[PDB]
Amino acid sequence: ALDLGSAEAKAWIGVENPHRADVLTELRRSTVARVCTGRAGPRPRTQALLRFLADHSRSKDTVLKEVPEEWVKAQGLLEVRSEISDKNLYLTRPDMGRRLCAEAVEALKAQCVANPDVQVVISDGLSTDAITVNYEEILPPLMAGLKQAGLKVGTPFFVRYGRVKIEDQIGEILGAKVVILLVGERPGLGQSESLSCYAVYSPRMATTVEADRTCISNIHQGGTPPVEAAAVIVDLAKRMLEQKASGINMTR
Amino acid sequence: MKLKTTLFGNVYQFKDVKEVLAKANELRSGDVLAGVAAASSQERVAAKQVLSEMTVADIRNNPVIAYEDDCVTRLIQDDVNETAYNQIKNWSISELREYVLSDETSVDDIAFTRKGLTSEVVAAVAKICSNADLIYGAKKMPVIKKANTTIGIPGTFSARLQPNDTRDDVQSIAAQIYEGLSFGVGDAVIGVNPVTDDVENLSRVLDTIYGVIDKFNIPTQGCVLAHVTTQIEAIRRGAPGGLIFQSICGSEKGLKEFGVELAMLDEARAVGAEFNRIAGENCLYFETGQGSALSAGANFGADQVTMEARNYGLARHYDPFIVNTVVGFIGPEYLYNDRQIIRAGLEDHFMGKLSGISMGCDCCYTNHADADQNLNENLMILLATAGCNYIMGMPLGDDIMLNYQTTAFHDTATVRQLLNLRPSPEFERWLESMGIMANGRLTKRAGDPSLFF
Amino acid sequence: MKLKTTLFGNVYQFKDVKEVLAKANELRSGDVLAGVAAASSQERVAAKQVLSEMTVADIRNNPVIAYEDDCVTRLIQDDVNETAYNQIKNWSISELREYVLSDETSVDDIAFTRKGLTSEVVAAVAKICSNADLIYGAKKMPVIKKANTTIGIPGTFSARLQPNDTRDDVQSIAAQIYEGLSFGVGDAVIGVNPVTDDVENLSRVLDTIYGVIDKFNIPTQGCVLAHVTTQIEAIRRGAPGGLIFQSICGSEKGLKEFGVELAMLDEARAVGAEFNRIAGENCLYFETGQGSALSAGANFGADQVTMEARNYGLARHYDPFIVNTVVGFIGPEYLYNDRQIIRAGLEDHFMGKLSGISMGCDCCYTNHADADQNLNENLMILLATAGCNYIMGMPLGDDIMLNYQTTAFHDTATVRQLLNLRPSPEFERWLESMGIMANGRLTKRAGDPSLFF
Amino acid sequence: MKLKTTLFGNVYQFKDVKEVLAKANELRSGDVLAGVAAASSQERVAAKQVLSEMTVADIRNNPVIAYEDDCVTRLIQDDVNETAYNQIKNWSISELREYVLSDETSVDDIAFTRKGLTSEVVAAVAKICSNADLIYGAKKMPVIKKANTTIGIPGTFSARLQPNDTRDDVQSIAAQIYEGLSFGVGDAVIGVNPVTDDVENLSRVLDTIYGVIDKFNIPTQGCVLAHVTTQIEAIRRGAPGGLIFQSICGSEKGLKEFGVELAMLDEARAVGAEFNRIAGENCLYFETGQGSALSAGANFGADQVTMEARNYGLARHYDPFIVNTVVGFIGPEYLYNDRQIIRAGLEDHFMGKLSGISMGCDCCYTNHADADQNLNENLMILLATAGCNYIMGMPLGDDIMLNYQTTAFHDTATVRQLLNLRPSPEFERWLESMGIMANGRLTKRAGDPSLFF
Numbered sequence A: 001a002l003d004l005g006s007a008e009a010k011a012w013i014g015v016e017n018p019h020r021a022d023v024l025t026e027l028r029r030s031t032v033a034r035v036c037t038g039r040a041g042p043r044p045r046t047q048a049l050l051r052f053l054a055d056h057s058r059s060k061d062t063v064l065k066e067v068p069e070e071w072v073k074a075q076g077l078l079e080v081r082s083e084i085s086d087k088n089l090y091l092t093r094p095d096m097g098r099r100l101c102a103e104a105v106e107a108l109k110a111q112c113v114a115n116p117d118v119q120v121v122i123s124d125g126l127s128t129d130a131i132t133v134n135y136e137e138i139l140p141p142l143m144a145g146l147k148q149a150g151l152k153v154g155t156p157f158f159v160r161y162g163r164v165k166i167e168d169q170i171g172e173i174l175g176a177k178v179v180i181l182l183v184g185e186r187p188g189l190g191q192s193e194s195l196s197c198y199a200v201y202s203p204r205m206a207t208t209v210e211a212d213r214t215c216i217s218n219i220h221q222g223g224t225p226p227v228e229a230a231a232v233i234v235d236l237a238k239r240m241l242e243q244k245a246s247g248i249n250m251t252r
Numbered sequence B, C, D: 001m002k003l004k005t006t007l008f009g010n011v012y013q014f015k016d017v018k019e020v021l022a023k024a025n026e027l028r029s030g031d032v033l034a035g036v037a038a039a040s041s042q043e044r045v046a047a048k049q050v051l052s053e054m055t056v057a058d059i060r061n062n063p064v065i066a067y068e069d070d071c072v073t074r075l076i077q078d079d080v081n082e083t084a085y086n087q088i089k090n091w092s093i094s095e096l097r098e099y100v101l102s103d104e105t106s107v108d109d110i111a112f113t114r115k116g117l118t119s120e121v122v123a124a125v126a127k128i129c130s131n132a133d134l135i136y137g138a139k140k141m142p143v144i145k146k147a148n149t150t151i152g153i154p155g156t157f158s159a160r161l162q163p164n165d166t167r168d169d170v171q172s173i174a175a176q177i178y179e180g181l182s183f184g185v186g187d188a189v190i191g192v193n194p195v196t197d198d199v200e201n202l203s204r205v206l207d208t209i210y211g212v213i214d215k216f217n218i219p220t221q222g223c224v225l226a227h228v229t230t231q232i233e234a235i236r237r238g239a240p241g242g243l244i245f246q247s248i249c250g251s252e253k254g255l256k257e258f259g260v261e262l263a264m265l266d267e268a269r270a271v272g273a274e275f276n277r278i279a280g281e282n283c284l285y286f287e288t289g290q291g292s293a294l295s296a297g298a299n300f301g302a303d304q305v306t307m308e309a310r311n312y313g314l315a316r317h318y319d320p321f322i323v324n325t326v327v328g329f330i331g332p333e334y335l336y337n338d339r340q341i342i343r344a345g346l347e348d349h350f351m352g353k354l355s356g357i358s359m360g361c362d363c364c365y366t367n368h369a370d371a372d373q374n375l376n377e378n379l380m381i382l383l384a385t386a387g388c389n390y391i392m393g394m395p396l397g398d399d400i401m402l403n404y405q406t407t408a409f410h411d412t413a414t415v416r417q418l419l420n421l422r423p424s425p426e427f428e429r430w431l432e433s434m435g436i437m438a439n440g441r442l443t444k445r446a447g448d449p450s451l452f453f
């Protein structure tokens, strides 16, 4: 008996007659990649393929699950959304996900801190799990360090059905010096909690290019710890404010 | 020139060449998102017929982006051999398609004919080609390059070892390297996608890659697929140089989206000649894929197949060692399902081979698109019969960092033994001495990464 | 045996082997129409894991139809080599899949192992096989038969000449014959699907086929795909007999739908031995396809893949010259789109080669299905790499009578020249004598039907 | 480094690297005329031993002309792969010679090692190499290039058709063209040395060459060996361009003597990419020869072997299709007799192959030198065993215009049939289609120019 989602199935070694089986367990402990699964001729082994399909079924489910309306309110966040109305349209209209809706822009100028130096924006993107799993672990330490020996920190708000380029409109609307977008990356096979950070200095919808942003990706327990990522994002925004540049326009 | 035809008694008129190029495309979600797709199957066929009756001069003199407004257009137009163009300028695209597909057309004939083409003409041929047309046409157009291994020889099949980690951890990266080498993967390159973009990260990943290369005297090359500027910087400061990588887009505004100038690629060519550990003459690596120009708002009303062909005209200028499209890397907003991803992978490889570059393909998909791993195995075999220069390799095709599924190390060994294909002759010699391969097939002790210990 | 598994902490219960076999299938419209498909992708993987842990005895002892209630079940069960069965009765379906795919497993190893299998066990292995598994596994399982041509030799590729007409007009049928021969098509069989099912019409078409065969001394065989009863009567009356055809189903109720008794197949074997112009020892021809058992209400709660596998255990008893699935002949109610038709094509061919029959495939689709001609070109190449024994051939693939689209005459020549495959050695010698083929490639005058005049 | 050695108890002091390189040369009249030769055979061996003990860095850091004072020195120094240099900078010239000659050293080993060398280091190895060393070392160092023909493949042997005339008469030039083609000569290039240096005369000769090329569809390329400026202007005006030629020298003062700027070679590369009828990527042609730098007073106290080696480091920067030394073209003031001309021929070819250029040799002599036609036949065979890429060809070797004697059309056919060497594979296919060659040998009707009529 074996649960394909169990840790025992994830740590399975499939090499039949190994040269050094102890070394194989050393490689298996060294990576999350599906190594040391063996082979059946030149094809993958049966159990390794079965776990692949079981992980794909779980990954395809996380694509359409939205962060509940009660969760974003439980964090005391102002929820707002782009021009997208549902996740089916979100997958086919990236342009509509890069523009705030008509009620979105008005809600921003009404409830958010005007002309901040660091504006934090949290959005679902393509991974709800990247938001709900990593939030409480990264947001308190991020918004502390931005304030401890800090500056004018804007008001947080959640953007539903949002893409990365929508942070150029947010910085233009609020006049923010630095815009920090925490967004869930597209779902992987073994996990779907990967959170990313895209930061740009004083963005403009008409001139800001994608290379003007600094990217910190793979923020999760398997990757960069959300606590560890909070300290480096605060340090980043400090350097983007000192240098008055972001993306490839920064030194080192 | 004619921009109109009559199909079943109904007249189908089009505005310009850019609309004819776009509406002749097979149906994909990207052309609908751009508003340039045909409204029905009749107008798509009508657009193909009008496109097939246009001449090479009609499409060369009408680039989707003007000469004076786009440096990629200038590079494509400036690199045209005008003698080869004047020979074929009056050929209709229907005649150029039959010319490429003809068994009376040799490889040397195409070698001179493709110099009279532009990327717009290359895309025009792929639009009026069936899936078997794209496969057989590309098979008779091999492109051979040499770094520390020779790639693209008919009867051979290479693969890139892709060991990505969520934190660029050198223990996780090395573990996937020993797994890929045990399956015969890595004759294209051992290329790492970096989760960061700092210079000290790249050198640490490169030192790990080349520590394995120098340990077992592996004939191959290393690469970290960060931005080209920080690649140049790390190599300029002592990091071992092999292949220099940069993502490219078919327009100037698309290059500005990636932060890339054409002078950066000239510098990468000069840094490789002074620093890189490459025995051959080719050391550059580009990656493409349909939908990049549309994502950057830099397609200018052109379809994603024409814009993808402009990638190949830009890459041909720098004579790279390898180019591969990442056919299903972005999402379903540009390529929705199995049918569109296979069609794009066949188009991209055919256009890359017609452009004269060492065209490979990352047969891949994402988890928010309508596809599964059976799609990767379908396309990897179709492209292999088309003479695809190389594919990617990861443990079971599961990328723990890029959050997508590509081909497994099993998949390269499967294709090689199914179609009786060998690796690069330099790499095959190493696998034989390592006891991993014999007569192109994996030995009993192959597929075991603990063999290197 | 276990009818249960825990996936992600969730317990999945399954009724019997019939439900596990059905739900382990990849998603297809026929299983949804049959009410036997998995409710979710999670249950589908659960059914695969439960299926992988069941032994060969679990599925051999649990056929989808009872022995005492179905003559096909009796034929499959009585033909089992019991010594080979006892060697593998304790193996799980997971161990049998790894045994088939193993490079340490030779053709002679499978030659004896397959005799201990039943059709339900053959379907079980295919359900837990990926698309590349079905391709590589079928490639290492060649089945060679011989009539007037030898088929199935690795490195060869045959093709059926299919000249159909709306009124069985022999002049229209003969026109398509010269078209196919000019492309190298016809080494499998020159088989005509008849509009009428009368004896004199069948004999008239046969005289036309063999008039061309005798005039140019073509090493091949003729056939008219009518009912087996009227084929036998026409041959008894003096019509030239080559291959004797009959459509088959995987259940006794399914055979009754076609009006076929098992004694009719014994008679066709006895008539062929007395009358047919065949040099080899194989002279029978069967066609299959998923959905036929469900169309007749004769699947009895089983999925269309397990029922299709039962066609092969039945056909193996008569050792025919050629068998081929008509993968997308019926409609989208059984196989909806490109993904399902490709999957079924790889399934049917792998199951046929595992059962030991000369398995081909009619790569085809209907106009009310979600498919086009680029699908046929994708599947023919994937199956050719899998060692498919033969495909069909019509001018551009358009059947003017059966109202569907198969592969073109161009398609066989493309496959052969793309993959370096030859025709049947006897037929290739004839094409070389006719100046149609040299070194496995079409000559300059090939593809021209006026060459025979 | 040591500038001194004790030979037979006698201390030999040398001034700098320039004197050691010059005195280590074998005895030739040019070095005596240059005042740089060794005073005795004892000092010559002393200069060889001192040269053998100096490292690669000693000679790389001591070019015969300063960097800031010579653009050729800058081009040679800037093209050095510094990573490959640091691997070998501490090796002595003795260890580098044994490294080149080693059977454990592969072509790919030298492919990277040669990038860390300079022209002065290339000459250093040749000075301490015997005649068989120069032959075996150059044989294991093949350089393959491709225009419309592929040249340099081991087992092949090419030849330049050289039809010169005293008045550039095209009818006399065309007569020699049919003579050479009837012997299998012309796969390297059909290059005419022109009496006049005007544009219309150049274009008239080009139209004559390509009129023969286009009539019989000959896979080759035409050239008129005039100045590079008038070649470019003629091609810009519409004359058919194949190879663009220019004589080169190993110093900036030497290039000024010919009236050549390095920008002129950049322009010929850019003009060839826009106009020339070349299928491959190589279209440039350079000719060299010892004594040219001393003739222009542009050797600056260096010997003619080190100056000739600098032609190759310059030519390598432009990656031409063919380079060849004209070994005995000038007179006895630089190369006196048979022994010196044979030695220089082996020297020049070995140094060219070590530098990575498609090295040929015009085995020739003048009538005021101490040589005859038996010398040309000795050197052509020694160089053919050394893998010489090509030689010249004239009727019996008599140049009616250049007033010297090279190799005959018979000479290429003799070499090929004596050593079982083939022509360029594209050209060999054409000779077989013309009934001139079968199985690498001249047919009965070969050698007859009236065959083309």
Ligand code: B12
Binding pocket: A125, A126, A162, A163, A164, A165, A183, A184, A185, A186, A194, A196, A210, A211, A212, A213, A214, A215, A216, A217, A218, B193, B194, B195, B196, B197, B225, B226, B227, B228, B245, B246, B247, B257, B258, B259, B292, B295, B329, B330, B401, B402, B403
């Ligand atoms: C898909 C993808 C791309 C796509 C983006 C197009 C698209 N519509 O998605 C393409 C193929 C163009 C791409 C290109 C590059 N990418 Co990228 N990309 C990804 C990937 C896999 C997903 C990001 C994601 O899920 N975003 C969430 C979604 C909801 O947001 P989105 O608005 O749909 O997508 C936007 C961003 O993803 C952004 N983007 C994508 N890649 C990169 C890279 C950088 C440095 C920046 C600032 C932005 C950026 O562009 C999109 C349009 O706004 C990540 C890997 C990961 N797991 O995070 C790597 C990743 C972010 N990319 C990366 C790199 C290295 C690049 C390149 C710089 C490569 C190169 N050498 O040129 C380029 C240039 C990017 C640019 N300046 O425009 C690295 C970042 C390293 C770092 N710490 O800076 C990552 C982490 C992984 C990798 N190695 O590929 N990428």
Ligand SMILES: [N+]
Binding pocket: B249, B250, B288, B289, B290, B291, B292, B293, B304, B307, B308, B311
């Ligand atoms: N693109």
Ligand SMILES: [N+]
Binding pocket: C249, C250, C288, C289, C290, C291, C292, C293, C304, C307, C308, C309, C311
């Ligand atoms: N069936």
Ligand SMILES: [N+]
Binding pocket: D249, D250, D288, D289, D290, D291, D292, D293, D304, D307, D308, D309, D311
């Ligand atoms: N020289």
